[PDB]
C-alpha cells in the first residue's frame, strides 16, 4: 500500500524549506521524470508555494495551481492537462483529495494538517489508484506532532517513517531569494495559516500559546528578520477578536 512518512521540523517555516529539498532530490534522482501532488492549508499559501516552485522548478517541470476560487471551466482543463503530462506537480488545497482519479503520481506531499483527520486519507488516496506504488511525506513542525498522536488513537494510523529536519543557510537563502513578495503579501498569507490553523487548534489538541506564535514568526522567517512581528492595525485586530488578549502581542505590531 501507501508508503507513508513524516519529516519533523523546529519551525513551520522550515517545513517550507524541507519541501524544498527533498523536491530538488526527486528531480535529480528522477531526472526530471517527477509527476507529484503537493497539498496545502490556505488558498493564499498555496498561491505562494505556487510561485515559489514556479521560480525554483520552471525550467525543470510545469507546475500547476488548484483551488476552491477557481472557475469550473478552468478546474477541467487544469485536470486534462495534469492527467495528460508525464511529469509536473500539482499545488492545491482540500479542494482535491475527493473523487479525482490522476495517474501515475510518483508522490504525495503535505504542508502541514488537514482541515480534518479523515482528509489526510482523501489526500493520500489520490496516488496509488492503478496498481502503481506510491509514497506521501507530510511536513510538519514540532509544535504539530499531536496530530500523528491523534492518528494512532483515532485512526490506528501509524507512520513508520520519521525523521527530523535542520535547513541549510544555502536552501534558506536559495528560497529567500526565491520569495518575490512584497510585506504586504506576506502578511495577507501568514494571516490566511494563523485563521486556519486557529480553526483546528481545539480538534487536534494544539497548545495555541506555542502554535500561534510559531505559525506567525513565519512572516519573520520569510522577510530574513525573525524578530519582526507582523505589521497590524487595531480595527482589525479588533475584527479578529484579539484586542484584549495577550499572545497577539507577541505576534503583531500595531502600527496604526
Same mark, same amino acid.
Given at each position: 500500500? &501507501?508508503?507513508?512518512?513524516?519529516? &519533523?521540523?523546529?519551525?513551520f517555516?522550515?517545513?517550507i524549506?524541507?519541501? +524544498? ?11 526530471? #521524470? ?5 497539498f496545502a492549508p490556505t488558498v493564499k499559501f498555496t498561491s505562494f508555494l505556487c510561485s515559489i516552485?514556479? #521560480? ?11 483551488h476552491?476560487?477557481?472557475? !469550473? #471551466? ?17 499545488v492545491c488545497t482540500?479542494?482535491?483529495? *475527493? ?10 506531499? !503535505?504542508i502541514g ?27 510538519? $513542525? ?13 485512526? #490506528?494510523? +501509524? &507512520?513508520?517513517? !520519521? ?23 506576506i502578511?495577507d498569507i501568514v494571516i490566511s495559516l494563523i485563521s486556519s490553523y486557529?480553526? $483546528? ?14 505559525i506567525?514568526?513565519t ?7 525573525? !524578530?519582526?512581528? =507582523?505589521?497590524?492595525?487595531? *480595527? ?7 484586542? *484584549?488578549?495577550? =499572545? ?9
Amino acid at each position: 500500500s &501507501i508508503d507513508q512518512s513524516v519529516v &519533523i521540523s523546529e519551525k513551520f517555516a522550515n517545513s517550507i524549506f524541507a519541501a +524544498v529539498e527533498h523536491i530538488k532530490k526527486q528531480i535529480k534522482e528522477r531526472d526530471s #521524470n517527477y509527476k507529484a501532488i503537493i497539498f496545502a492549508p490556505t488558498v493564499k499559501f498555496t498561491s505562494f508555494l505556487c510561485s515559489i516552485l514556479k #521560480n525554483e522548478f520552471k525550467k525543470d517541470l510545469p507546475i500547476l495551481e488548484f483551488h476552491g476560487k477557481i472557475t !469550473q #471551466n478552468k478546474r477541467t482543463s487544469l485536470v486534462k492537462r495534469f492527467k495528460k503530462d508525464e511529469s509536473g506537480i500539482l499545488v492545491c488545497t482540500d479542494v482535491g483529495a *475527493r473523487g479525482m482519479d490522476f495517474p501515475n503520481v510518483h508522490e504525495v506531499l !503535505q504542508i502541514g494538517v488537514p482541515s480534518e483527520l479523515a482528509n489526510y486519507i482523501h489526500r493520500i488516496g489520490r496516488t496509488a489508484r492503478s496498481g502503481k506504488e506510491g509514497s506521501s511525506v507530510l511536513f510538519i $513542525c514540532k509544535d504539530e506532532l499531536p496530530f500523528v498522536r491523534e492518528l494512532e488513537d483515532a485512526k #490506528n494510523i +501509524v &507512520i513508520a517513517k !520519521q525523521e527530523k529536519y535542520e535547513p541549510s543557510e544555502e536552501i534558506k537563502s536559495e528560497v529567500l531569494e526565491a520569495v518575490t513578495e512584497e510585506p504586504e503579501d506576506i502578511s495577507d498569507i501568514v494571516i490566511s495559516l494563523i485563521s486556519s490553523y486557529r480553526s $483546528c487548534i481545539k480538534e487536534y489538541r494544539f497548545s495555541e500559546r506555542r502554535i500561534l506564535p510559531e505559525i506567525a514568526s513565519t512572516y519573520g522567517v520569510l522577510l530574513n528578520d525573525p !524578530q519582526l512581528k =507582523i505589521p497590524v492595525s487595531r *480595527r482589525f485586530l479588533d475584527k479578529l477578536g484579539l484586542s *484584549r488578549s495577550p =499572545i497577539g502581542k507577541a505576534m503583531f505590531e500595531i502600527r496604526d
